[model samples]
Target: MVLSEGEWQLVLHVWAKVEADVAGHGQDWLIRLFKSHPETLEKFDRFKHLKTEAEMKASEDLKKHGVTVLTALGAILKKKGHHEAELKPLAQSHATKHKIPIKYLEFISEAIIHVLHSRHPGNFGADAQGAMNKALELFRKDIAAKYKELGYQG
Candidate 1:
């Protein structure tokens, strides 16, 4: 089933919080989220372990990027307009390059938010939500413009 707009907004807000706190909370959030939804782990094997130091660092980086992108996109949507027109092509390219389904890009907002809210309880209030909206807007504008400048049609 498709997520509602409010659900999507929650996802973006949570993603922004995750991005801001990845260094501190991301690793634990990943472990908990994956343990509860083991099937989701199949989407990215990079979540397999925190065994090695490098592996742990990589996990944090991945989570951070996910949060950063989603948060930015939310902000752009709120301030400017729905940027999916521009984002869809870039997401398609990234998904192709990574051998992940293009649809996975849509979950970036959902997954991160799930983790953040589950971890932080009600800590993500209105101010935090506003911040996320702003961040997402900027992210879309910046990335979409860059893609266009680079002649990214896909």
Candidate 2:
């Protein structure tokens, strides 16, 4: 298992709150990511036009995309250890179709972590953070392995 029983619960505990407001949390994640790495935003033609946080906050496209991404995350988490089946297709699409680098994946992870800490500081305590760190590492490892399998050389 990617996380221990206690660790899994810790993550799910926070996830429940995040899932409750996927659109808001997901957009917050994107805002944090874009702020930290503006260059990453350039990769998304659809979102590149959003130059400010206010613009991103008011965007329907951003809200739709955010909900989609966060809902996918909840889907994978709901399946527990069987998520490789889910991750494979996502990893393949990001690696080959989108041609997104693994570094960007790392950035997304960091952004999520940042968002969680800020948005749910009470639920996302140090213990939860540690558990989530492990979970994300496993997530990144799976995606990176898929990138390698597809000869993407990231």
Candidate 3:
């Protein structure tokens, strides 16, 4: 499905909230998402009961993997824009381990922005669209770096 500009803004807003540490907002957005897209619920059963402690633990676990992926993504970004082949495996592996669908990755990304908007509504004004674009660019770079580490050249 195609996302509109408003929807994209929500995505950035959620991410900002996640970065700002607004758990409630994150939870609320996730709930709203499930209510709107019930099918996504099945894909994210692993994260259905995500508590602060559990999220913290997961964040910690991501450090090592994140580093590896970033390194790979960085190498790939040096040559081109973004590499899906290099990135999808990492997404798939994480999904498999967590029993989450790869599609939920997109949901998680949007939910993050929603949380951010809830926390700093003022700071996350109309410019959110641009900000989200920039954020995605950074995300692409990160994924590209990870792909490079995974030995993906293209």
Candidate 4:
């Protein structure tokens, strides 16, 4: 999870804007994730039965879950460094309790990037985008390691 100072700084810069409305952005992110990969919706018991896009948009449970995820991301950004220690427990929970596959992390990362890029087109420059991707991949790797240890094949 080694990253250049410039990389983290770039990530933090754009993340600041997301922080202003993490709940709204996270909801948007989840909707985009579900749209891009419908199977992911099945991972959530609360959202699994939500058949329509409008139903998803209107879901208070969905909004709460989205905010929870974004809050974790916000904590990671606030750390401004590798935060694998934090994700270990998160991986454990997702693997054993929530039953979220490892691939969902990638989907979440992709959707979040899309959300930020769409919202902050002017601030999310090429370098910032690259930095954000790098940061996300590192986090994914850390979580995957824990998932493997937990014997979750996904």
Q: Which RMSD values do the candidates have, in order?
A: 8.1, 1.2, 9.2, 1.3
lDDT over C-alpha atoms for residue 149 of model 1: 57
Task: By TM-score, rank the candidates, best first.
Answer: 2, 4, 3, 1
Candidate 1, residues 1-154, lDDT tens digits: the string is 2334664566455655555764455455444445555554576655554454456456656667545544444444454344556566565455345443323332443454555556667756665554444444454445545445555532
Cα-based lDDT at residue 40, candidate 2:
91
**Model 1 misplacement above 4 A:** 1-33, 45-81, 99-110, 119-154
lDDT of 1 at 74: 42
Point out where model 3 deviates above 4 Å: 1-21, 46-95, 99-102, 140-154
**With candidate 2 superimposed using the best TM-score fit, by how many Å does residue 37's alpha carbon deviate from the native?**
0.7
Greater TM-score among 1 and 4 belongs to 4
The residue-by-residue lDDT of candidate 3 on 1-154, one tens digit each, is 2335564555544454444533344345555455555666555455445444446345433344334433453343332334455557764455345444434545645654564566667666657645554555555445545545555432
Clashes of 2: 0
- 1-154 per-residue lDDT for model 4 (tens digits): 6888899899999988898997799899999999999988887777798988899899998899889989987897667665767777888888999888777888889999999999999989899999999989878777787789989976
Q: Return the top candidate by lDDT.
A: 4
TM-score-best of 3 and 4: 4
For each candidate, give its TM-score against the true structure. Answer: 0.40, 0.95, 0.42, 0.94
Full-model lDDT for every candidate = 0.50, 0.86, 0.49, 0.87
User: Which should have the higher lDDT, number 1 or number 4?
Assistant: 4
Highest TM-score among the candidates is held by which one?
2
> What lDDT, from 0 to 1, does candidate 4 have?
0.87
Clash count, predicted structure 4? 0
Checking candidate 2 for backbone clashes, the offending pairs are none
